Amino acid sequence: KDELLYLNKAVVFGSGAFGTALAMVLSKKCREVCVWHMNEEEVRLVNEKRENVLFLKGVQLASNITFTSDVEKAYNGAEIILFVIPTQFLRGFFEKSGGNLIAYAKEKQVPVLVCTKGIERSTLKFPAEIIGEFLPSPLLSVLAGPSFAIEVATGVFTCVSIASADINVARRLQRIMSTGDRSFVCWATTDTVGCEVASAVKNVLAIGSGVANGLGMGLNARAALIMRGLLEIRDLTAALGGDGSAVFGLAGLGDLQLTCSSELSRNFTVGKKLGKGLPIEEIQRAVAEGVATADPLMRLAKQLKVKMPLCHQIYEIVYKKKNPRDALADLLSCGLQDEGLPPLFK
Amino acid sequence: KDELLYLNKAVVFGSGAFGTALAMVLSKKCREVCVWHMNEEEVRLVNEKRENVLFLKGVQLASNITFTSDVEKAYNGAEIILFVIPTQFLRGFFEKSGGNLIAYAKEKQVPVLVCTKGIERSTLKFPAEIIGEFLPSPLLSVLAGPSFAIEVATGVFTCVSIASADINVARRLQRIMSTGDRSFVCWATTDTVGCEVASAVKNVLAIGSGVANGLGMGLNARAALIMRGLLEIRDLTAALGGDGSAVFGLAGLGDLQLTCSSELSRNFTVGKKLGKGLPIEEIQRAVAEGVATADPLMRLAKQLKVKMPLCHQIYEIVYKKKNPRDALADLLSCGLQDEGLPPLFK
Numbered sequence A, B: 001k002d003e004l005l006y007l008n009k010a011v012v013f014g015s016g017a018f019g020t021a022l023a024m025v026l027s028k029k030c031r032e033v034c035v036w037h038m039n040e041e042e043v044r045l046v047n048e049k050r051e052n053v054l055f056l057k058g059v060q061l062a063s064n065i066t067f068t069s070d071v072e073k074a075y076n077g078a079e080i081i082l083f084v085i086p087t088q089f090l091r092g093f094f095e096k097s098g099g100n101l102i103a104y105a106k107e108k109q110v111p112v113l114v115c116t117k118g119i120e121r122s123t124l125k126f127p128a129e130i131i132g133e134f135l136p137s138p139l140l141s142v143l144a145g146p147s148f149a150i151e152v153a154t155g156v157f158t159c160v161s162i163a164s165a166d167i168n169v170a171r172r173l174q175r176i177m178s179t180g181d182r183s184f185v186c187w188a189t190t191d192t193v194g195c196e197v198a199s200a201v202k203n204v205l206a207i208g209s210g211v212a213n214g215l216g217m218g219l220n221a222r223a224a225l226i227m228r229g230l231l232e233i234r235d236l237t238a239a240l241g242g243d244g245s246a247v248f249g250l251a252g253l254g255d256l257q258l259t260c261s262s263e264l265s266r267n268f269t270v271g272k273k274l275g276k277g278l279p280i281e282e283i284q285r286a287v288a289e290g291v292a293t294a295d296p297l298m299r300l301a302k303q304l305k306v307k308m309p310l311c312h313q314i315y316e317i318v319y320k321k322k323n324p325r326d327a328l329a330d331l332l333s334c335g336l337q338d339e340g341l342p343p344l345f346k
């Protein structure tokens, strides 16, 4: 259906930039919107300042958005639940505080939208998979696409995709997340796996995009990294069982191109410094998603016997003090090859 | 084979930036390299200045590169012929001066590489197809990929693809164009049609990327245009008989992302001005490829009953004084849809 759906309440667990940006999106489709944060003193500050000075400074929060550190109040009445908690804290949240919320979720059959992105070190599992350990798959959906928080929060034209096993589940969410002014447009897909893989790998590849820059290469080089790196996301997706229909969609191609062209992103800057020779230790100072993700990505790929050329070299440069230039050469040592893309039309 | 091939002579018909940039690439794989230009007085100047002050200022030409306005001398002895003449002058060249050259080409079975990009107004045909009217298909190959002339001419890491019906023909050329320092890497593909379609459509879409900017949208918007516009190149390719294996390769995704992220390109700037409301007439002042290409692209699409949403609106804004904002709204009037991408894995 091409007609939207408005709700009375919507809860968003994750008080960071993206979660807040999404609260902003929701403020225009939901009568009430609570954003769960943990530090109570902070929850107050924000509500006072009418601004998430913590993770989204400069953005005036809508009035119908309320921050609360009380999970119970937070989810109570919500007709849609969003999870934008960093991957590393996700599991802990459910073990320590998801008790009742999970009950409520199952009870009222509330639709859950996974917005977190990454890989859990301990299990090498993705967000929606982790949450899936507590909440049934049928209720789970994934939101992925080129969506810089700031642009989304301030209402600047953005397109993302909603992935769910049941396309109809994705479409319902599609009608809930899409805004009245068409400033936030959603596209439905079933490729949950592809979306999750892409959301994670993109950060690693972003670092390579930065490496390429600090290494003196230009835009041609970047377009090639983006195009070649996309096959790596494709192959890892295939290995994990995903149908891959999202790989060349907004979740993959889209977000990938965005994330890799973001010259100010921590991923890019970190990679740039590496490209210029600065050791990872020296850099540090606030870790880049790509850096955190690189190790487990490598372990998952290895475990699945999936070859990710670019991602691997990026892992070496980061975790094994490999010279960016040597990495680049090793990468190109493969010799002349075919593009390696199947035809789409017979 | 992963081992290169060096030649004695190579001719490049097309004295513009890209042709010169490619002469530079060839200067490192060919003993001798002539670049055919038409104005004799100019051919001298350049040879004197050791620089193509006409279309590639600031770039010092290698010594083994010689400009000549004598087609006969130019092609004589060449072991590879490149065509980088603008689409509109292509046919005229062969009718007026290709006489002997064609003979020589067929005679010695010299490999031809089509580097020109666009659509001929009169026939709505692409470069390699036009040249194909004079030289047999078997000898023809297409070079396409994200390759800004300057970066290519100055040796900055670049990746492009070589497309030929016979993959082996593409691979031979692959070993001739790939450089010893791995600064120019070629990938083989068969999707000649896809490559040509992509090379042309990209310019139109670039204007939209500019429109989006002048219209106040941000990077999220651009990533979406790139991802959505790519399906248009896909569909037109399917309609023209291409196998489409290049659509998501360097020729398509690659070049597309590059061309659309080039904020200084004439396509972008023209589109930006349109996005800001300036009428096309006013703008002008040196035409943007995207503008020229928009009309025939539209006529070809219509003739083939292929729907290209973004390209169509871009055509309206340019040729029919349509308000960019109205165009954007008409575009989004489609309602909520699925991403519309087939799965890659069953």
Ligand SMILES: NC(=O)c1ccc[n+]([C@@H]2O[C@H](COP(=O)([O-])OP(=O)(O)OC[C@H]3O[C@@H](n4cnc5c(N)ncnc54)[C@H](O)[C@@H]3O)[C@@H](O)[C@H]2O)c1
Binding pocket: A014, A015, A016, A017, A018, A019, A020, A037, A038, A039, A055, A084, A085, A086, A087, A089, A115, A116, A117, A118, A147, A148, A149, A150, A289
């Ligand atoms: N930032 C973006 O533009 C964007 C776009 C898409 C997806 N994402 C995804 O969003 C998530 C994070 O992005 P962000 O900018 O919203 O977040 P952020 O880094 O601004 O989030 C900080 C959040 O982490 C919590 N936190 C910090 N330390 C904690 C601890 N020890 N225990 C429990 N909670 C703790 C805070 O209370 C807060 O909710 C990731 O999954 C990322 O991939 C971000």
Ligand SMILES: NC(=O)c1ccc[n+]([C@@H]2O[C@H](COP(=O)([O-])OP(=O)(O)OC[C@H]3O[C@@H](n4cnc5c(N)ncnc54)[C@H](O)[C@@H]3O)[C@@H](O)[C@H]2O)c1
Binding pocket: B014, B015, B016, B017, B018, B019, B020, B037, B038, B039, B055, B084, B085, B086, B087, B089, B115, B116, B117, B118, B147, B148, B149, B150, B289
């Ligand atoms: N510029 C790039 O970075 C790039 C990258 C890929 C493909 N291309 C393709 O290259 C071609 C043009 O790009 P460029 O920068 O090399 O060229 P350019 O615009 O710099 O080329 C000018 C050329 O056109 C010729 N010319 C001009 N007017 C003429 C007339 N009336 N009759 C006959 N010849 C005339 C000149 O003598 C010269 O060879 C297109 O096919 C384009 O799609 C360019």
Ligand SMILES: CCCCCCCCCCCCCCC
Binding pocket: A208, A209, A211, A212, A215, A221, A224, A225, A228, A309, A310, A313, A314, A324, A327, A328, A331, A332, A334, B159
């Ligand atoms: C991390 C450094 C910069 C990388 C710039 C891009 C390289 C692109 C091509 C990779 C080809 C891989 C071929 C198979 C092993």
Ligand SMILES: CCCCCCCCCCCCCCC
Binding pocket: A159, B208, B209, B211, B212, B215, B221, B224, B225, B228, B309, B310, B313, B314, B324, B327, B328, B331, B332, B334
């Ligand atoms: C030319 C103006 C700016 C366009 C910015 C991008 C719009 C992207 C989405 C297009 C969707 C088309 C849907 C089907 C008709």
